[PDB]
Amino acid sequence: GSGKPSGLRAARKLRIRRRTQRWADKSYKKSHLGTRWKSNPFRGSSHAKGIVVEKVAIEAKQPNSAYRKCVRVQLIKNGKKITAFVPGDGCLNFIDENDEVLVSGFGRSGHSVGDLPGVKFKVVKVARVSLLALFKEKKEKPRS
Amino acid sequence: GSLARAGKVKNQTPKVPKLDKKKRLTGRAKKRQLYNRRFSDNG
Amino acid sequence: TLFGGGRTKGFGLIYKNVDAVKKFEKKYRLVREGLIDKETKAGRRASKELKNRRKKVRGT
Amino acid sequence: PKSYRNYSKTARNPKRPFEKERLDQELKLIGEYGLKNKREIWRVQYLLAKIRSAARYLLTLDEKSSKRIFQGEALLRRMVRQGLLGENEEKLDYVLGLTLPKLLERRLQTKVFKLGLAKSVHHARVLIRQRHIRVGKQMVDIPSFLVRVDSEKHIDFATTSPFGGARPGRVKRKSLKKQKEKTEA
Amino acid sequence: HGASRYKKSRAKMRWKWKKKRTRRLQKKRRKMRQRSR
RNA sequence: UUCUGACCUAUCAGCUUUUGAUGUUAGGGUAUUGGCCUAACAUGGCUAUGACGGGUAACGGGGAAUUAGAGUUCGAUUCCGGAGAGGGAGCCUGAGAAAUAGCUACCACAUCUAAGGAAGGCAGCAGGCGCGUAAAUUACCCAAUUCUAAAGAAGAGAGGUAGUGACAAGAAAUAACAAUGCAAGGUUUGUAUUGGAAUGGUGGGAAUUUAAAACCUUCCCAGAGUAACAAUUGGAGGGCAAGUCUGGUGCCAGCAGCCGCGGUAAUUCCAGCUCCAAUAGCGUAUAUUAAAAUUGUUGCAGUUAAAACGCUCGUAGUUGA
Numbered sequence: 001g002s003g004k005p006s007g008l009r010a011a012r013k014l015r016i017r018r019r020t021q022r023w024a025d026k027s028y029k030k031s032h033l034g035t036r037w038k039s040n041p042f043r044g045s046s047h048a049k050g051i052v053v054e055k056v057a058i059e060a061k062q063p064n065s066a067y068r069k070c071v072r073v074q075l076i077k078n079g080k081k082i083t084a085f086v087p088g089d090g091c092l093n094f095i096d097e098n099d100e101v102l103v104s105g106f107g108r109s110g111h112s113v114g115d116l117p118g119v120k121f122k123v124v125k126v127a128r129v130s131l132l133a134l135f136k137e138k139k140e141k142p143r144s
Numbered sequence: 145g146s147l148a149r150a151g152k153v154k155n156q157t158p159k160v161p162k163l164d165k166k167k168r169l170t171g172r173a174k175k176r177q178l179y180n181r182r183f184s185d186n187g
Numbered sequence: 188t189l190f191g192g193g194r195t196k197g198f199g200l201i202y203k204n205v206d207a208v209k210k211f212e213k214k215y216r217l218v219r220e221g222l223i224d225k226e227t228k229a230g231r232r233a234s235k236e237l238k239n240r241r242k243k244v245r246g247t
Numbered sequence: 248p249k250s251y252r253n254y255s256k257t258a259r260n261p262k263r264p265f266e267k268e269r270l271d272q273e274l275k276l277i278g279e280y281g282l283k284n285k286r287e288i289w290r291v292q293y294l295l296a297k298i299r300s301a302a303r304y305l306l307t308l309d310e311k312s313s314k315r316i317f318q319g320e321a322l323l324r325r326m327v328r329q330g331l332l333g334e335n336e337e338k339l340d341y342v343l344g345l346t347l348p349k350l351l352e353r354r355l356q357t358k359v360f361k362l363g364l365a366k367s368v369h370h371a372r373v374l375i376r377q378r379h380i381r382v383g384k385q386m387v388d389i390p391s392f393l394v395r396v397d398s399e400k401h402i403d404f405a406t407t408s409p410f411g412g413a414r415p416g417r418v419k420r421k422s423l424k425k426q427k428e429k430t431e432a
Numbered sequence: 433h434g435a436s437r438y439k440k441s442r443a444k445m446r447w448k449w450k451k452k453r454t455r456r457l458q459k460k461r462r463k464m465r466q467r468s469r
Numbered sequence: 470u471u472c473u474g475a476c477c478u479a480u481c482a483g484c485u486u487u488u489g490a491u492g493u494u495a496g497g498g499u500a501u502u503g504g505c506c507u508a509a510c511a512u513g514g515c516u517a518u519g520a521c522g523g524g525u526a527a528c529g530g531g532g533a534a535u536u537a538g539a540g541u542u543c544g545a546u547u548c549c550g551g552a553g554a555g556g557g558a559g560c561c562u563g564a565g566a567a568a569u570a571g572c573u574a575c576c577a578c579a580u581c582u583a584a585g586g587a588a589g590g591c592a593g594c595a596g597g598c599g600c601g602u603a604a605a606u607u608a609c610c611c612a613a614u615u616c617u618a619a620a621g622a623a624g625a626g627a628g629g630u631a632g633u634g635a636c637a638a639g640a641a642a643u644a645a646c647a648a649u650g651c652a653a654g655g656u657u658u659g660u661a662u663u664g665g666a667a668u669g670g671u672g673g674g675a676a677u678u679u680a681a682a683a684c685c686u687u688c689c690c691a692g693a694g695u696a697a698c699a700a701u702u703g704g705a706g707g708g709c710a711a712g713u714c715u716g717g718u719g720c721c722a723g724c725a726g727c728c729g730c731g732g733u734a735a736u737u738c739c740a741g742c743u744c745c746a747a748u749a750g751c752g753u754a755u756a757u758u759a760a761a762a763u764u765g766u767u768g769c770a771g772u773u774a775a776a777a778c779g780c781u782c783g784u785a786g787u788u789g790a
Contacts, residue, residue, distance in 0.1 A: 004766085007787050012518075014766070019477095022764060031756095032477075037526060044526075046755035047602040057146035065720040066731085067146045077601070089723060089739095090151035102602080104754045107726050114725075124753070132752090153722040157739050160716085167699060170643050171748080172283040172369065178745095179278040180660075183271075185653065188677080188687040191378070191386025191405065195677090195687085215612060215680055225680085230609075231626085248547040248628095254638045264746070265709045283641085284748070366646075373645055377668050389640075407688095409667075417667075418692055434775070 040110065041080040042121075050075040050082070052099040055092065061115035070119060073101055084121040088135040094142065101126050258289035259296070280351045281360075281368030287391070291350050298322075302342035329353065330396035355380070355392035358402055379408040 005013055022028055030036055042048050054072040059065075069092045073084045084103045086092050102125035106113045110120060124131050133140035169177055188195050202208045208217075218224065227233065261269070276288055301322060308315040319339055326332035331349060332341060351357065359371035359380060372390040374380055380387060382394075383401040394402075404410035433439075438447040 003769095005787065010787055011766085013787070018764065025764065028764090034524080034526095042602090042755080044756080045602050046753095049602080055147070057150070060720095063729085064731090066723070067149070067721085068723085069146075069150050087724090090154055093151040104602090107754070109755075114727090122754090149721075151722080153718050153739050155739095156722080157717050159739090160741055162741075167643095167695080167697090170700065172277075172281065172372070173644070175274070175277050175283075176281075176369070179274050183275070183278070184659065190388075190686065191381065191407075192687045193384075193406065197677095213612070219679090251547070257639065263709095267710065270710070270746085285746095286748085370645055373668080376642080377645095379667080391640085415667085419666075436775075 041075060041078060041082055042105070043078060045077075047102060047104050048075050048077050050077070050084075050101050050103055052095065052097070052101060053081065055095075056083070058117065058119070061117065064115050068116060071095070071099075071101070071123060073103060073121075073123070075103075082121055083119050084123050085116065085119050086123050087131065091131065091134050094134060095126060099126050100128075102128075258286055258293045261285075261289060276347075276351070279368075280354065281356050281372050281390070288347075292347055295345065295347055295350050298342065298345065302339050306339045306343070328395055329393065330399065333396075350393075353393040354390060355382070355387065355394060355402075356390035358394055358399060362402060364402070364404070374410075377408075379405050379410055381405040381411075 023032075037043065050073040052071050053074050056070050056072055057067040058070050059067055069086065069089070071084050071086050071092070072081065074081050082103070084101070085106065086095065101123045103121050103123045106120055106122045108120070112118060112120065126134075127143050129143050130140060134142060168174065200212075202212070214222075214225075261273075264270070273285055273288055276282070277285070280287075282288060305315050305319045305322065310316075322342065323332065323337070323339070326342065326345075331345065331353065336344065355375055356368055356371040359365050359374060360368050364380070365371040365374045375390045375392075376388060378386055378388050381403060382392075382398055384406075386405045404412075407413045409415040440447065444450075
């Protein structure tokens, strides 16, 4: 009493009420609506190959003061322009004018990361060579 | 400008070699030795 | 031998006569015992030469 | 087609890793039982938990229920075969009474150390690993081998080992022999 | 906002005023629709 | 051919019916029932229990992942059943095919041409191109497993065997021990200098295994002290286990799931040192379950935090002294 129907033959109400009310969940909407397969430029891949269009220096969100060196990349896979982060300070300096990048997601399932403003992707390999190795120097030598 | 400014600190710092290192224990030996170092007299 | 040896397990067969050995034993096993090496060694190149023929144009 | 043989994971991870008191308890278990990995604890724990889950299912099922009494007698009989339950313990509530040290004690390295064939759990582990132990005339290389009730007193040295009374033949021992022989010659 | 109206905490400008701006805006848009069609 | 069982969608509510929709009759057709097809005659039939459309990154099941109990997600992908063989379509042959290494034609492709003409179809096995975030050899064999024939004795890229394989899964090294020095305990136990014992991997030969080769195992030779026969991956403010450790940068460079660190003495950046976690594995992304009694049958909430239809009647609905 004072709640959901107890009735034996009331499964119909419980199913319809549940079915309709399910949609307000955020994860359920993204997964069960078509927008997933549409609006994501990675289109259900973790990873994508693109080419660097522009090197840009984005200023950090209000609590911090700092310019984050980033790369505007055009995906070859779907022909889409994205802005991607490049980890490693001198690695951006190493990276070339129209570099071929293997870009990934950024640890947050299409949501924003830290003080970066809508930059939802990060480049993790360039010209088939590893970003970590480029950052290291003990590990694998730069490309020719 | 900010394009110039990029990559400073790693290049800037005066790097030092990692010099002479003795090899560590592995495995069961390393864990047992660690257990003894922490927990025997010092537990 | 099995792990740590000192034991060897196998399988043996002893036939009634030499005619039985010829009759009911496998050719590789007869070779392994002692018999001549296998005939017509060529894989599928045999098939390739075989399939070419049209109605007694040539035997070869 | 694919191979039709089955396979299964050895363990379940203990989650929430930096529970200090739990972590240090595992280190004490490693220290005691001559183990190489937390995974060793976790596999023996997983086996114990599988047993505990079975024992819970049986004791939750009714008295005199045919499957339950059969499977229960079979389980206890197996505990007797393993020697995991001994003489003084003989019902499903003693299976619930079973503990992770009791299972760990079943390891061959523990038995070798206990019998005093080797001087320590690690020395026992290496003695087994160097193929120098044998259980009932079977050479064995596995220190984690879980002994049955009968086999505990059937543990002695591998026959073709030095400790078996056969040849050492070692590079050292042979080198000394060559040195003596060259000296004499 | 949500479907539910007003709820001035600290909030912003007046909800009735936001509503006035949108009602006026919708009419303006309706005039753009009229221009179109 | 009977019964029973579906994901999402109402910003899809009336559909179906001259072109058989639904019935009746008569025939024809079929392998046989059958609007299966033709004629004649009826005017029905299906629809909130969501019909009819539309979506689906939708082959179906046995099942898989996570499951305390519910559940939730997932099921090309070893078996069973279906579908398809460039697109559509049509036949022939035969008991069985609307076959596809059967045929014919059209469209989409496309090869040789002697310029008249002619022939071609990998979503069989390799291998290649393109696509891409992403995936192996034109290897050897019919010995087993089975299949087909004029059925033993022959065939079979079915099937087996290797090669490439850190997809996963299991087992499992990277020391052990005695001397000394130190430590604590007053004549004991524990542990950083030394130095003699034990050993696989590794290199070679066999026995053996095999279609053959290779692996396994087993034996015989060889054979470690820096046991160079070289443990890595990521951390040490908090969440969260270990440093107010040593230098450098100076709100810059930068890092860091999140909070944050950085404006000169940085416990977070760049090095170095020590320490810690897991370990031959550990990072990273994306998707997914738990987390979430944060979708709630079990098991939610609605005075003030989000949420009682303005109100009442009322058919279906659900509930019924």
